[PDB]
Design a protein around this ligand. Structure first.
Ligand SMILES: Nc1nc2c(ncn2[C@@H]2O[C@H](COP(=O)(O)OP(=O)(O)OP(=O)(O)O)[C@@H](O)[C@H]2O)c(=O)[nH]1
Ligand SMILES: O=C(O)C(=O)CS(=O)(=O)O
Ligand SMILES: [Mn+2]
Ligand SMILES: [Mn+2]
Ligand SMILES: [Mn+2]
Ligand code: NA
Length: 608
């Protein structure tokens, strides 16, 4: 069988058995053990005891602190160099560049970062050999989607970070039951290392292992591999989330006829008890989580959360667009969360939650900018830098909570239903301080796809089509064609498409619209429009609410002519910016129908 000990790693297994693994899982584990040279192999079973043991271990190692105020909550503080996703160090590898991004006309692509296989092999070899020396390689078997769902997909993540294991237990369905469901089936291969083999060549900051210089988050869709090095943070290390559920999945979806999108999924119920599901794509830090868990101000209205970040959607045999949330938890921006901006999150995160880079109070609680809560006389604050802090923010602006979805008091009764929830409306939006109205509705499916493609958002006003700029797993031109093709599907029940702007400002630079829970007044209008109410007025950019169509009672000085005003001058500029972007960035792969919508919008604006 072999001539020495060789490639049998059985003797290093501290939990599980290599013999009991499905053979391709075994090969994946053993091959990467040979490569990365971990001291131990720990096959995760997903049990409470394992989780228990692992938190204790991290506490013992000074990697996390227990937050004594709450029930089983923990705080991790990071190296200030490793605090977020980094788009620039994120790449996709294909034989042909054009499969990954459109070939731009004049400029550099901002629709992805392609890397040749040969550049990646050099990069890979400069990073992973020996990279786990002295550490445990954890084998995390995980399901994206409920453990049986026809939309669900299985991954195996190898990692040397117990913080990733713990976070993956919350953010995915993890453990032995996943291996048992996998059998000899296909799985996504996820390899992760913090890139700090022992003994340490460089000094660790705040006991947070990372390698900023060599950080690289790679996707290789044709090998169905995700390979990430150097960062322990969120989207860089929790491979099921962005790398798998958006980048890899979007390419699988294109091939198999479904969608993987940066969308919340919410259930909304009117005072009659009539309920619809909606999906919404906003860019990062633009309000998905606040919307998905909204506490509505309008009496009788209820919002329930199916998911807050990622949607997998597919037309069923009946023509309804079905959506699942493939995550098991919410990895939510901490700062700005308060009892008045997101009371439901406040209720969720007080137990079994891991916080990263927030501040800690002397009585063992958490603090951040915009928490909007007085502390008791005597209580002091340690900032995310492990320094005494008084009113430098006390929490990193991308600090995060990581919390179980099942704990959310408004979690939707169907949030785990294998068949998904039927989508009747899709909402696009971002941060636009000027010009873009509070809400408008697309003229058609094709206009709506154009509206998604035309999305922009203040970081500078960036382009962020479908809120997927950082997450396209393949050519965006082909992504547009894929969306447009959904109108060719027989019997498809195409949802209504809306665009919102919560962030318009006045000359004084303050928000024209109160937002948060008051956004229920906008969802009410959308609900009525889905029902077919004659509550809309035609404008050059699409349908807006008629005068007195929105419930504005009680706000009360809301400048509707400013909120809904449509300036020829602004829109002339806007279409110019959309045109230049699409021509350069999508170029030869821009579908005809999108160019036609551009032309049509330009024409309607010229007639003002
Ligand atoms: N003015 C205003 N700000 C809002 C509203 N909703 C959310 N925000 C702001 O948006 C930020 C929080 O956004 P998140 O919900 O964390 O963004 P997200 O889309 O969930 O981001 P990812 O989880 O990174 O995808 C804070 O600055 C909030 O003040 C709103 O209705 N009005
Ligand atoms: O950046 C985002 O859109 C996120 O949802 C957070 S992360 O998962 O990418 O770290
Ligand atoms: Mn030790
Ligand atoms: Mn979020
Ligand atoms: Mn996101
Ligand atoms: Na730390």
């Amino acid at each position: 069988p072999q001539l020495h000990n060789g490639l049998d790693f059985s003797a290093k297994v501290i939990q599980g058995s290599l013999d009991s693994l499905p053979q391709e899982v075994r090969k994946f584990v053993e091959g990467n053990a040979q490569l990365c040279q971990p001291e131990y192999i720990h096959t995760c079973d997903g049990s409470e005891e394992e989780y228990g043991r692992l938190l204790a271990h991290m506490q013992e190692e000074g990697v996390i602190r227990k937050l004594k105020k709450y029930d089983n909550c923990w705080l991790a503080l990071t190296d200030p160099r490793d605090v977020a996703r980094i788009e620039s160090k994120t790449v996709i590898i294909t034989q042909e560049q054009r499969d990954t991004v459109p070939i731009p006309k004049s400029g550099q692509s901002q629709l992805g970062r392609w890397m040749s296989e040969e550049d990646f092999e050099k990069a890979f070899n400069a990073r992973f050999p020996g990279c786990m020396k002295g550490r445990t390689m954890y084998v995390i078997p995980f399901s994206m989607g409920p453990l049986g769902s026809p939309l669900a997909k299985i991954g195996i993540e190898l990692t040397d970070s117990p913080y990733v294991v713990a976070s993956m237990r919350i953010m995915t369905r993890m453990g032995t039951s996943v291996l048992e469901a996998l059998g000899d089936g296909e799985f996504i291969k996820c390899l992760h290392s913090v890139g700090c083999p022992l003994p340490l060549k460089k000094p660790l900051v705040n006991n947070w292992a990372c390698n900023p210089e060599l950080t690289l988050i790679a996707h290789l869709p044709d090998r169905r591999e995700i390979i990430s090095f150097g960062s322990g943070y969120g989207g860089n290390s929790l491979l099921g989330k962005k790398c798998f559920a958006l980048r890899i999945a979007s390419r699988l979806a294109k091939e198999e006829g479904w969608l993987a999108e940066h969308m919340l999924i919410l259930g909304i119920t009117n005072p009659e008890g009539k309920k619809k599901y909606l999906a919404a794509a906003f860019p990062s830090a633009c309000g998905k989580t606040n919307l998905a868990m909204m506490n509505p101000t309008l009496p009788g209205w209820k919002v329930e959360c199916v998911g807050d970040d990622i949607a997998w959607m597919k037309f069923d045999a009946q023509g309804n667009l079905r959506a699942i949330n493939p995550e098991n938890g919410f990895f939510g921006v901490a700062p700005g969360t308060s009892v008045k901006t997101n009371p439901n999150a406040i209720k969720t995160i007080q137990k079994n939650t891991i916080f990263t880079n927030v501040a800690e109070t002397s009585d063992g609680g958490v603090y951040w900018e915009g928490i909007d809560e007085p502390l008791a006389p005597g209580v002091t604050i340690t900032s995310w830098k492990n320094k005494e802090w008084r009113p430098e923010p006390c929490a990193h602006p991308n600090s995060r909570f990581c919390t179980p979805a099942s704990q959310c008091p408004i979690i939707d009764p169907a949030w785990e239903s294998p068949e998904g929830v039927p989508i009747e409306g899709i909402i696009f939006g971002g941060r636009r301080p000027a010009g873009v109205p509070l809400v408008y509705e697309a003229l058609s499916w094709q206009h709506g796809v154009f509206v998604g493609a035309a999305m922009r958002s203040e970081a500078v006003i960036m382009h962020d089509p479908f809120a997927m700029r950082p997450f396209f797993g393949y050519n965006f031109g082909k992504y547009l064609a894929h969306w447009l093709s959904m109108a060719h599907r027989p019997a498809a029940k195409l949802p209504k498409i809306f665009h919102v702007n919560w962030f318009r400002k006045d000359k004084n630079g303050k928000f024209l619209w109160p937002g948060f829970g008051e956004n229920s007044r906008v969802l009410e209008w959308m609900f009525g429009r889905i029902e077919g109410e004659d509550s809309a007025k035609l404008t050059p950019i699409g349908y807006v609410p008629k005068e007195d169509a929105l419930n504005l009672k009680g706000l009360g000085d809301v400048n509707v002519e400013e909120l809904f005003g449509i300036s020829k001058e602004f829109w002339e500029k806007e279409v110019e910016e959309i045109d230049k972007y699409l021509e350069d960035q999508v170029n030869a792969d821009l579908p005809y129908e999108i160019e036609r919508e551009l032309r049509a919008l330009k024409q309607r604006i010229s007639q003002m």
